[PDB]
Subunit: 161 residues, 6 copies
């Protein structure tokens, strides 16, 4: 069950593939290559136009058929040095992230079975909750927080002991 790290990896891979070096229309920040989940915080992060994917808490409920409903959360932060205008650039980055989340397809999985092979699976639904930004201080830099939720269905490894 869980699949949390696999979900994060699929998310960052989807952002990278669908955002980089293609389709000037629709999506436009042209991240050459960057986005990841292993390296974050602030210190380090020597480049700009970088966006980070965090890991958050989850919630769970039990349905009376062995099916599992699991709610998962992913905080997303965006950084941009100045260029034209902190507000404009942060809003443009968050808009591109949002459209990549929404308009194209369902989320994909690359789970690894116990000491076996990878069996791809899908993700039921995706919802983007409130998205906030930083304040005036730390003037030349800027932040953009994104709160997104994922609802996956774990494999029913029940009723099969």
């Amino acid at each position: 069950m869980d699949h949390r790290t696999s979900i994060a990896q699929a998310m960052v891979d989807r952002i990278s593939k669908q955002m980089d070096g293609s389709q000037p229309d629709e999506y436009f920040n042209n991240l050459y290559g960057n986005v990841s989940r292993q390296t974050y915080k602030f210190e380090e992060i020597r480049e700009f136009p970088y966006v980070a994917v965090h890991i958050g808490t989850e919630t769970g409920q039990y349905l009376p058929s062995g099916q599992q409903w699991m709610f998962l959360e992913l905080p997303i932060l965006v950084y941009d040095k100045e260029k034209t205008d902190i507000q404009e650039q942060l809003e443009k980055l968050v808009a591109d992230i949002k459209t990549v989340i929404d308009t194209g397809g369902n989320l994909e999985y690359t789970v690894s079975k116990p000491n076996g092979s990878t069996f791809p699976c899908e993700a039921t639904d995706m919802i983007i909750t409130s998205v906030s930004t930083d304040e005036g201080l730390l003037a030349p830099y800027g932040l953009a927080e994104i709160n997104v939720t994922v609802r996956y269905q774990p494999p029913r490894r029940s009723l099969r002991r």
Copy 2:
């Protein structure tokens, strides 16, 4: 979608063009020219009669046709020095700003399409939430908080 800073720019342009040096009746602050969002806080801003717009969190809901609804928030701050009575000037500014927000039409809007041109759009509705007031301390200056919410439809639909 998103489309926040353009909401801010549209509101700033509307307040600036609607308040400046025209219509002596109805509107009474006569800002020569001023209102912006790039520069705020308190430091700098060497004039008074200065009103500022902030940008804050917005929340969204998913209607079952691919349609989007998003409620956005803007804090408004007003400063004034003392020509006569600080409370009177503050309420004067707040009344004028509320009038300009409410009475005239929907907001004009200036989206910027990917690597293309600007296609004008609208803003659904305007709502004025609580109006706070500053305190006695920092005597010669004064503040007047305004809470306003915006609800726009983002010009895009899901699969």
Copy 3:
């Protein structure tokens, strides 16, 4: 709209005029002249039997006819030195304040039309909320916190562009 400072000025004028030098019956503080809103805090205020009104937050709701309902709140404090006793004399003050607020008529307005003349208006209702009291410390002095709410109808400057 608003009319907030006009409301405060009208209420303080009502208190001062209706409370001073007249009607020994039903009213007993006989304030020579004092009640105001511009000067408060504690420092200054060299006299006593002084009473001050503050300015507080407001709340607004929109009715589907262009009519506006705005709730306005006014915190009022009373300062009084000694004499007979702090408790009874402060409560005598606040009892006079309550009776002058409730008993006699609705409010009056002296609002200002944009670059024009003053057109008087009325205020719908007054409701008096909790009335707190100070504590033992600062012994020779005492406070009396009284909170009042005002429900006015702003001029319908809508449907007329």
Copy 4:
């Protein structure tokens, strides 16, 4: 209206008169004389068996005939030293106070009209809420909180 200080004074007079040197049955603290509201806190109060009555926030509601309903609050504090047990003496004082509040009639009242005479009145009903006490520290003395509510009708009506 308001009238709360006279409510407190009447309650103090009632406890003093009903508790002192009379009726060995029912009431057992035999307070010779003490109970007041002018002097409290802890400092001073050199004797013991003292009990104090405070003054607190009140709330009001408007019925549609000009009638007024106002709920009031009185914190009550009891102190005891150590003849035998601090807990026992505290509960004995608390039980006697609750009995005197509950069993006997409505409260008497002594309003003073504006520059006139004293016209006695009544008090509608008595309600006593949670009863808490002190902790281990400050060992030789003891405390016992009493929370009571008062609901009076103000002898006046609106327009």
Copy 5:
């Protein structure tokens, strides 16, 4: 009314008599003699396997027949000192306390009428709420908090002035 320390003393006497030096089945701590309410806190308490009962707040509601329903709370604490295992011994003691409270009879009373004699009474019900356990720190010692509630009927000393 009240009768609070009557409840506390009856409870502690019940624990003592029903728990000490008898019935090696069912009840298993063999507290030789100890349990009390006057002495607590931590400092002092030189023995061990000691249990202390506190006094807490109460709550009261009024029924329209002169009957009073009063809720009273009693926090209970236990202390133990190594021997086998802290967790085991603490839950050993708390299981004994819980079964003594629950399985055997209703509470008794030794209340005192004004300057008279003792007329025993009863207590309607007992409920035992959440039971917390202490943490690793202060290693050789350990706590296990018990929160119980009682619901007695105060004597209807109303309608009889």
Copy 6:
């Protein structure tokens, strides 16, 4: 009643026995030996495939036949020490722990009667609530919080 420490022993024994050096399929942590409750905190624990089980507050309700219902809470913490990804190893551990909690039967139980013998019993149902994750700081190590609830009936009835 109560019975918490034996619940903890049953949980630790079950995880240890279902976890060690058997069934390469399904279960992939191969913990040689670790899980316990006597030693925890962080200090000590010089190995870091370790998993710890805590003890928490429980709540009870009274059904009207003398039957008792008790909901118990168990915080579970997992540590790990690199070798590839901290996040990946933590999620693998959490998935394996959730699997072992859910898939196999009700919990076995080993109550000890007063000065008697051990009579095995059962545990009604297992529920796993929210699962938290650690933070960036303290980089080379990792945390993985698990919160589970236990609902056992006490093998005794009231009068």
